[PDB]
Amino acid sequence: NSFSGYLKLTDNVYIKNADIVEEAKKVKPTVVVNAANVYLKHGGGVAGALNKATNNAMQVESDDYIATNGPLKVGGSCVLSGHNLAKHCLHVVGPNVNKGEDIQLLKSAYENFNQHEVLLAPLLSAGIFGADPIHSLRVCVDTVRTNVYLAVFDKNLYDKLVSSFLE
Ligand SMILES: CC(C)[C@H](Nc1ncnc2[nH]c(C(=O)N[C@H]3CCN(C)C3)cc12)c1ccc2c(c1)S(=O)(=O)CCC2
C-alpha cells in the first residue's frame, strides 16, 4: 500500500491522475477494485485493462466463479484473486445508466468498499457506464468510510473533479 502523489480530499478519500493498472503494479495494494459487469466479462475499458495485465488469468478465474455461483446483481460484488496486481480483486458492479440501470444503485456499489480497510479503485459508473463523474465522486465521499485511493486516468477529468470538490 505504497501510494504516492495522491491528493487527500477527505480523511479517507485520496485521488490521483493515473492509470489504475500502473498504480497496481507500483503499489502492490491489498485490494484493487474492478469496474465489473454482472457476468464478469472483462471485454474492454477498466475491466479489460486489468484482465490484460494478468495475461487473461482474471477472466478464466471469473468464468469459473460464474459457473458455480451465478451472476452478480447490479450494486453487488465478489472477492477474487488479485493475481499479479494485488492480494485481492474486489469486482464491483456499478449501474450502467446508458443501459437504463438505476443511478441509486451507485450507493450500494460504493458500500461494498467498506468491507476492506484500504483499496485502490476507479471512479464507479464513469466513462461508458454513463454516470455523471462529479456525482460519482460525491457518492464515494458520502458512502465510503474505509481508506480509498481513486485513480482517474484523464488529467482533464481529474482537474474538473478536484475543482468541483474544493468549491
Ligand atoms: C473515466 C475514465 C477516465 C476511467 N478510466 C480509467 N480510470 C482509471 N484507470 C484506467 N486505466 C485505463 C486503461 O485503459 N489502462 C490501460 C492503458 C494502457 N495501460 C497499460 C493499461 C482506463 C482507466 C473510467 C472509470 C470508470 C469506468 C470506466 C472508465 S469504463 O468506461 O471502462 C466503464 C466502467 C467504469
Residues with CB under 6 A from ligand 1: 19-21, 35, 45-46, 49, 122-123, 125-129, 151-154, 157
Resolved by: X-ray
In CATH terms, the fold of domain 1-165 is Leucine Aminopeptidase, subunit E; domain 1 (3.40.220)
Instruction: Please report how many Cα atoms fall inside a 13 Å half-sphere around the Cα of residue 82, on the Cβ side.
Output: 20
Pocket residue to mutate for ligand 1, from 46, 96, 139, 149, most atoms within 8 A of Cβ: 46
Pocket residue to mutate for ligand 1, from 15, 16, 19, most atoms within 8 A of Cβ: 19
Atom 21 (ligand 1) nearest CA: 49
Retrieve residue 38's grid coordinates: 454482472
- What is the Cα–Cα distance from 124 to 136, expressed in whole angstroms? 6
In the chain, domain spans:
1-165
